[PDB]
Amino acid sequence: RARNSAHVVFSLNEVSEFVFTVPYITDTMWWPRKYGGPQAAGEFVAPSYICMF
Amino acid sequence: ISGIIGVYGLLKPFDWNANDTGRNVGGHLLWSMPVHPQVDKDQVIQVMTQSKLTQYYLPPISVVSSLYAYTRGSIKYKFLFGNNPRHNARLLVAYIPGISSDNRLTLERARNSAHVVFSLNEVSEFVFTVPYITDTMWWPRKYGGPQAAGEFVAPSYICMFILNPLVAMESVPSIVTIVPMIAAGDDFEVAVPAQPAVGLSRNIDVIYPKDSIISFKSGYFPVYVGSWHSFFDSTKAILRYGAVSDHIAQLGNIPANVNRKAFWIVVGDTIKFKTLDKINGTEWFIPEGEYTLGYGVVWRDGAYAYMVPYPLTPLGEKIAQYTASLLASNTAISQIRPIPDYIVDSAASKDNILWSP
Amino acid sequence: MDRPEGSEERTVQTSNVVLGETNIESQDIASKEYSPTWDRLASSEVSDEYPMLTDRWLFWKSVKWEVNDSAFGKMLVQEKFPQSWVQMDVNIPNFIPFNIHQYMRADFEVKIYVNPNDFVSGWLIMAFLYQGSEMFDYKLRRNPAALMQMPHVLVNVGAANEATLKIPYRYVRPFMRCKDILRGDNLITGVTEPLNMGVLFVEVLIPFRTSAASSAPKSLDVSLFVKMTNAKFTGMVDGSIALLSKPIALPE
Amino acid sequence: MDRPEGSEERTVQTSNVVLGETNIESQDIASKEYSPTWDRLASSEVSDEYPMLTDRWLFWKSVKWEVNDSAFGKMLVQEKFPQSWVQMDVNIPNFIPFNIHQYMRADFEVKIYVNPNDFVSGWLIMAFLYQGSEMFDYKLRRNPAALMQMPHVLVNVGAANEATLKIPYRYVRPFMRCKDILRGDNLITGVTEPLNMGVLFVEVLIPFRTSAASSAPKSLDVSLFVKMTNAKFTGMVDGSIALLSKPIALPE
Amino acid sequence: TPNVMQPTPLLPTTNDGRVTFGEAFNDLKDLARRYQLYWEGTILEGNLRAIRRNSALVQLPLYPHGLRIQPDVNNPIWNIMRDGHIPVISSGFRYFRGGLRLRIVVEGLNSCVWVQHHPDRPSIFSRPIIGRYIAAKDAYRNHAYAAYVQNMSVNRTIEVEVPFYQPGLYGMLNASDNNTSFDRLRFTGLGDLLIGIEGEQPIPKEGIEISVYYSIADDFSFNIFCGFPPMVYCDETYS
Amino acid sequence: TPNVMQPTPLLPTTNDGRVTFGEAFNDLKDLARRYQLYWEGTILEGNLRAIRRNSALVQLPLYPHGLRIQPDVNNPIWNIMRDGHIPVISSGFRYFRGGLRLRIVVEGLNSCVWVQHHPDRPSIFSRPIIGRYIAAKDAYRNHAYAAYVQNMSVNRTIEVEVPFYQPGLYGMLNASDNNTSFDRLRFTGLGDLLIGIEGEQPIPKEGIEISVYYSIADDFSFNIFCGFPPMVYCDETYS
Amino acid sequence: TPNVMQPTPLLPTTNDGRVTFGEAFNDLKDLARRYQLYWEGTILEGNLRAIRRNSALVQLPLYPHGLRIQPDVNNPIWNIMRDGHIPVISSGFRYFRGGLRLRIVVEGLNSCVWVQHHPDRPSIFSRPIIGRYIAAKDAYRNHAYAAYVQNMSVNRTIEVEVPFYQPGLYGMLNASDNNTSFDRLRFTGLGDLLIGIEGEQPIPKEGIEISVYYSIADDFSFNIFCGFPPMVYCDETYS
Incomplete structure (x- = not known):
């Protein structure tokens, strides 16, 4: 199911370092911080999820 | 050939009653048939005889197409309505590619294909030129010379549905006969000469x-x-x-x-x-x-x-x-x-x- | 009418579909039509457009209103726009130009078709209200006196006439989500209503009046069409990475 | 309608006669219209033309079709064209522009007039078939499905509309005889049918449907007109040098 | 409402890409046919007259629309599938003005065969007549008529072209059969074709088989388009 | 039929002579209002928490359409005549993008007062909450938020401008109250305003009175015109 | 690694002197073949139907890759040495678009013979079928199909060219035999060829022998190269 979204396939063949620059795909322009000042009893949610298979 | 097959031929008519509280509802299938040059035998005016051959009143496009093996092009289906200004309705005629029956055919599915919505508001005639959507270039005739025990299949299916049920009045006929007519499009062509799938009705005597x-x-x-x-x-x-x-x-x-x-x-x-x-x-x-x-x-x-x-x-x-x-x-x-x-x-x-x- | 054929009927053609009309329309636009420029500022992913699929005119519903149920204010259709999701059980279906993607945006056009006789009278009023479902006075604004002040088209039953309502995209996102993000508390991150840009209102402006005859039709069908001028999709996911919840109907 | 007078009605004027129409026609031509050049190669005698008489529009018959007799295929008129010979007994009469001459030729124009109410529905189809009486499948080609493929005009009863069918001269002679040459055997010199160029077909395309009311008209009259563009006569004889036989009707 | 009339078109798509009738295939498809189709069967000794000299064996009426179909069990090509293309093509028209090409095959004989053409002979038959059963004063070879004498030792297929000799404007096709006029006997058919054998010598025991094939010509034309008569499907010739 | 549509006009007279909206009077009349209207009442000692230090006394939700009207007998300005111009003007529109100006008056104190603004705080309240009865972790002064500290010895009216900090295209006004979404808590209000007293010293016996007036700004805009909701006449508030 | 790929060549010598394929010999050797190879055997009287009139004697399916080989002791040319060049050449390719040339020899008859071509007839047979044992409604001469009528008195070898009439992009060769699709019946073969005798007269006691030879054409092309299927050596046909 992860292959049906923005993904990358890294090879580990004599390679020790690489970077996966993830996009910013959001319904809005700016995204509220997940953690914040004590004001409410609920932590906001992140816009996306990164998974390594 | 383009001159002849351009001439409109008449197909089996049908009544369109507005008083029918069951068949005159939004979504009902009024009329349908496979799309091909020749016409389905059950959609043609027939004259049967005991111990003789059945006679079919084929349209110009169908007779000629029965003289050729393959065929292609758009087909022009003209619908003539026997109504007056008082009658009013809307029909959704569609062109479903790859289908040959109405086993899985509904209005809410016909809208997902090449279709047209005709209004019956002071309008008695209109034409729905159906496309030629095929996996191949030329399409074999549905009916042919006696050589095998199987009739080939049409590439598509045309269906007429009800969008807004026909409404008439007390001082007007509740029945509006519909007369479907067929002609070949300007892009219609016939491929190869083969054994006629038709014969003359001069002598309908046969030896079965x-x-x-x-x-x-x-x-x-x-x-x-x-x-x-x-x-x-x-x-x-x-x-x-x-x-x-x-x-x-x-x-x-x-x-x-x-x-x-x-x-x-x-x-x-x-x-x-x-x-x-x-x-x-x-x-x-x-x-x-x-x-x-x-x-x-x-x-x-x-x-x-x-x-x-x-x-x-x-x-x-x-x-x-x-x-x-x-x-x-x-x-x-x-x-x-x-x-x-x-x-x-x-x-x-x-x-x-x-x-x- | 006056020809061996009927009168000449106007035509409207989009991708893979043709609509026929016979009379003059009644139209209006929701708000100032424009070109989205801050949408590219919301998604890093390239947007996608499917003109052949999104520009198509689709028929989604046909409601019947009879004289016995035709009263001033009678709501013939009250649904959240845009929501045209139809499936065997109450469950966006992939059977039409509909995509199971995270985010999207587009401008809409609503056409209402009604086909009455030469001998009936009545009036329908089709209006639209941007995010009316989120207003504290929603149920209070359903009355035709309030519908007259919103962007709207009028349908006369004493004339056979069509109508089109242009509804340009307006929202607070500016990308609305097609599916749910359900993991949030009521205090922060409340559940998000998928594709809820507003509420489409059709109602009885003037009670449907027919002839007193028995053999005369007492019911008339109101069919609707919807189309998208330009659609953009920026959320690419598995068709079942997220799921569709039962549409929460909101009637008064 | 909309004036102290009625609507403005179109006019058609030929020699010594005027026809009035109110709506748009439905027309078609039998075959490619032309100018006869091999006719002067059939007669040594100078041809004669009578524009003032032959160009006149004449009314010959008016048939009534009721709902009870209106069925798909019902033949309202089936006569050999051109044969417009009317006399006290079954017996060409000199009372109109008709001549008792041996040979003749001309192009014809058929106009069908029908005058229905605003509240009826039905369809008539007027067709023509060159020398259909001589075909081995004549009686087989009377069905409207076959009439649709022949040169023809359509009449709508749901609109008051006229129709004209141009029929240019086509024959094997190329001069058809007005009277008989009866002295011949069945094997050689068979009897010649005077003025038999074809068969004029009018029929019921869609059954005549009226209102269910008692005081409503259940019968409608179909009147016909015929005219000749250019006529030529090359056989000069005594009006009684040859005689007219009783027209052999040919119905199915 | 001309035969081709579209009042209000609702065309959802563009037209199909134009081919020429000869591109994805290599021949130009239009309605012209010089394809040869059969016309008759075989003859035996017991069919010919007592004095078979200068007496034709076959009296063939010349019709562009072919002969009147007659189903037999000895000949299934007429029974299971109806007559060829030509008579179904001519069924949609009224007049013709051209000549016909005749190819004739005579197989049971190695002796000379003749073929004569009688333009002015009234075509009042819809079926060929053979030998004794032929009307007298017919199937007698004439002197000053277009003819062709051919030896079967050299070639046993005769190819001739029958001309159009009618004293009229057109030629009528699809002519009725039994009871007249002056247009059905001299203006319908090109005439009659007589096929005979040069010798009076008896027919071989096995008999002779004559298959007549024909085609249209160049000076031929289907002038006026008429409606198509209702057809019969060959595919339903078993139930 | 656009919202303004005249099908067939029957105008018997000419138009009235044009004035400019500022001629027979001297101001230009258009729909823009920086007229200040009230928002709250008074507070007593028994309302504040046991430890009233860095604890705000008022939690003011920021709504362009004002607060949810609540009639009292102690406050007739809400009861005999409904809320001011601003919330009736915003009732005919759907979206806003500007900031608000707040003028705040504190009369029973001569000690320093603070005012802080919390943009990202979800606006899920339609009424201000005071002291002890305020939700915990709220009405606690934060560190890195826009604020203004003012001494009542110098001036007892605070004038500040609250900015528009929403991560969205618009700002939603006329928001429902009780049961959600993600558009009703972060996209409707500008946030919350906390008003507290610098000292933990007890409130004077007479108590303190806080009157908050507010107005629109320049970067503010009523974007989409909606229908007007049915109104109530203030003139019929006695029968 | 394309089909032709040489990673590291160790060539000790220069190349061989170039000849043209036609120099030390006088013909240009490339893969094109109009060499004629056999296709069928002989027929007797007891094979034909009771009514052998307009009834074909042979139903020949048209395949560029030849017919399905069937070894007999009466015919050693199939048994000791496998089928000719053509079907082994077509075994290394997938598609074809041309017509085929057919040379047909009929030796036991001195009576006329016909040959007809049915393009649209589904090629679902891998072996020719004769007389009575032919499926009904097949081996019945049709009217409007490409044909050639020839007298054996003049020449007893028929040479015709069968065209390519398929409603598709390609023509499939090396088609499987027994259980389907829509590509195996209308897109594989050029159709069927019917061979019959003009007369219904009985077959001579000695019987008739029909040898059908065929070749490729110019508009013919082997389009896509596939791997070669494992072959069988004719040299090992005795142990």
Whole structure:
């Protein structure tokens, strides 16, 4: 199911370092911080999820 | 070809009632059929006949297409409505590619394909030029020359649905007959000449797999009732094909599935002939006069088979009935003799006479 | 009418579909039509447009209103726009130009078709209200007197006439989500209503009046069409990475 | 309608006669219209033309079709064209532009007039078939499905509309005889049918449907007109040098 | 409402890409046919007259629309599938003005065969007549008629072209059969074709088989388009 | 039929002579209002928490359409005549993008007062909450939020401008109150305003009175016109 | 690694002197073949139907890759040495678009013979079928199909060219035999060829022998190269 979204396939063949620059795909322009000042009893949610298979 | 197949042909009409509280609802399927040059036999005006061939009033595009193997192009379906300004409605006619029936066909699915929405608001005529959506370039004809036991399939299916149910009034006819008409698009083409899938209705007579008894042989007709010196000293009647001696009309290949005790009947054009005294023990007697040939009994003489004439009369059918039974039991030739008599020759037939068990 | 054929009927053609009309429309636009420029500022992923699929005119619903149920204010259709999700059970279906993608945006056009006789009278009023479902006075603004002040088209039943309502995209996102993000508390991250840009209102402006005859039609069908001028999709996911919840109907 | 007078009605004027129409026609031509050039190659005698008489529009018949007799395929008129010979007994009459001359030729124009109410529905189809009486499948081609493929005009009863069918001269002679030459055997010199160029077909395309009311008209009259563009006569004889036989009707 | 009339078109798509009728295939498809189709069967000795000298064996009426179909069990090509393309093509038209090409095959003989053409002979038959059963004063070879004498030792297929000799404007096709006019006997058919054998010598025991194939010509034309008569499907010739 | 549509006009007279909206009077009349209207009442000692230090006394949700009206007998300005111009003007529109100006008056104190602004705080309240009865972790002064500290010895009216900090295209006004979404808590209000007293010293016996007036700004805009909701006449508030 | 790929060549010598394929010999050798190879055997009287009129004697499916080989002791040319060049050449390719040339030899008859071509007939047979044992409604001469009528008195070898009439992009060769699709019946073969005898007269006691030879054409092309299927050596046909 992860292959049906923005993904990358890294090879580990004599390679020790690489970077996966993830996009910013959001319904809005700016995204509220997940953690914040004590004001409410609920932590906001992140816009996306990164998974390594 | 483009000129001819452009001419509109009429298809089987249907009534469109506004008072029907069941069929006149949003979503109902009013009319549908496969999309191909030829027209589905059930969507064509038909004229059937007992023991004959069914006649189909095919449109210009269909007749021509039956002369060619493959075909392609858009098709123009003109819908004519028998309404007046008072009537009002909306129909959604669609073109579903890859489908040939309405087993899984609905309005809410037809909107997902090439379709058109016609309004019936002071409008009596419009045309829905359906596309040519195919996996291939040319498409084989649905109907063809007898060569296999299967009719090919059309590439698509056209369906007419109800969007806004027909509404009429009290002072207006609730029935609006619809007359679908077909013509070929400007991009319509016909590929390769093949065996006509149609024939003329000039003569609808045919010889089905029905055990017709073979009309003698070719070259052994026309035939007439005559005499034969080896057949009871030429006093009885047989069918000849020539005045010259040893010229008796021979029958063709009689199928081996026919009963040995069976006699025959004329199934086509026949001839008149004049012909027997009363037989012992029975009241069977034929008055001297002119009768129409109807029945007959096969007389075999080696590899050649001939035919013995019998008048078309309730009496003659029974006499030929017995004669057919006597020959089945190998009765003496002299005992079967009391077979119609030979009085004089008779008029020749136009052509080959047919027979049946 | 006056020809061997009927009168000449106007035509409207989009991708793979054709609509026919016979009379003059009644139109209006929700708000100032424009070109989205801050949407590229919400997604890093390239947007996608499917003109052949999104520009198509689709028929989604047909409602019947009879004289006995035709009263001033009678709501013939009250649904959240845009929500045209139809499936065998109450469950966006992939059977049409619909995509199971995270985010999207587009401008909409609503056409209402009604086909009455020459001898009936009545009036329908089709209006639209941007995010009316989120207003504290929603149920209070359903009355035709309030519908007259919102962007709206009028349908006359004493004339056979069509109507189109242009509804340009307006929202606070500016990308609305097609599916749910359900993991949030009521205090922070409340559940998000998928594709809820507003509420489409059709109602009875003037009670449907027919002839007193028995053989006369007492019910009339109101069919609707919807289309998208330009659609953009920026959320690419598995068709079943997120799921569709039962549409929460909101009637008064 | 909309004026102190009625609507403005179109007019068609020929020699000594005027026809009025109110709506748009439905027309078609039998075959490619032309100018006869081999006719002067058939007669040594100078041809004659009578524009003032032959160009006139004449009314010859008016048939009534009711709902009870209106069925799909119902033949309202089936006569051999051109044969417009009318006399006290069944017996060409000199009372109109008709001549008792041996040979003639001309192009014809057929106009069908029908005058229905605003509240009826039905369809008539007027077709023509060149020398259909001589075809071995004549009686088989009378069905409207076959009439649609022949040159024809359509009449709508849901609209009051006229129709004209242009029929240019086509024949094997190319001069058809007005009277008989009866002295011949069936094997050679068979009897010649005077003025038999074809068969004019009008029929019921869609059954005549009226209102269910008692005081409503259940019968409608179909009137016909015929005219000749250019006529030529080349056989000059005594009006009684040859005689007219009783027209052999040919119905199915 | 001309035969081709589209009042209000609702075309959802563009037209299909134009091919020429000869591109994805290599022949130009239009309605012209010089394809040869059959016309008759076989003859035996017992069919000919007592004095078979200068007496034709076959009297063939010349019709562009072919002969009147007659189904036999000896000949299934007429029974299971109807007559060829030509008579179904001519069924949609009214008049013709051209000549016909005749290809004739005579197989049971190695003796000379003749073929003569009688333009002015009234075509009042819809079926060929053979030998004795032919009307007298017919199937007698004439002197000053277009003819072709051919030896079967050299070639047993005769190819001739029958001309159009009618004293009229057109030629009528699809002519009725039994009871008249002056247009059905001299203006319908091109005339009659007589096929005979140069010798009076008896016919071989096995008999002779004559298959006549024909085609259209160049000076031929189907002039006026008429409606198509209802057809019969060959595919339903078993039930 | 656009919202402004005149099908057939029957105008018997000419138009009235044009004035400019500022001629027979001297101001230009258009729909823009920086007129200040009230928002809250008074507070007593018994309302504040046991430890009133860095604990705000008022939690003010920021709504362009004002607060949810609540009639009292102690406050007739809400009861005999409904809320001011601003919330009736915003009732005919759907979205806003500007900041608000707040003028705040504190009268029973001569000690320092603070005012802080919390943009990202979800606006899920339609009424201000005071002291002890305020939700915990709220009405606690934060560190890095826009604020203004003012001494009542110098001036007892605070004038500040609350900015528009929403991560969205618009700002939603006329928001429902009780049961959600993600558009009703972060996209409707500008946030919350906390008003507290610098000292933990007890409130004077007479108590303190806080009157908050507010107005629109320049970067503010009523974007989409909606229908007007049915109104109530203030003139019929006695029967 | 394309089909032709040489990673590291170790060539000790220069190349061989170039000849043209036609120099030390006088013909240009490339893969094109109009060499004619056999296709069928002989027929007797007892094979034909009771009514052998307009009934074909042979139903020949048209395949560029030849027919399915069937070894007999009466025919050693199939048994000791496998089928000719053509079907082994077509075994290394997938598609074709051309027509085929057919040379047909009929030796036991001196009577006329016909040959007809049915393009649209589904090619679902891998072996020719004769007379009575032919499926009904097949081996019935059709009317409007490409044909050629020839007298054996003039020449007893028929040479015709069967065209390519398929409603598709390609023509599939090396088609499987027994259980389907829509690509195996209308897109594989050029159709069927029917061979019959003009007369219904009985077959001579000695019987008739029909040898069908065929070749490729110019508009023919082997489009896509596939791997070669494992072959069988004819040299090992005795152990």
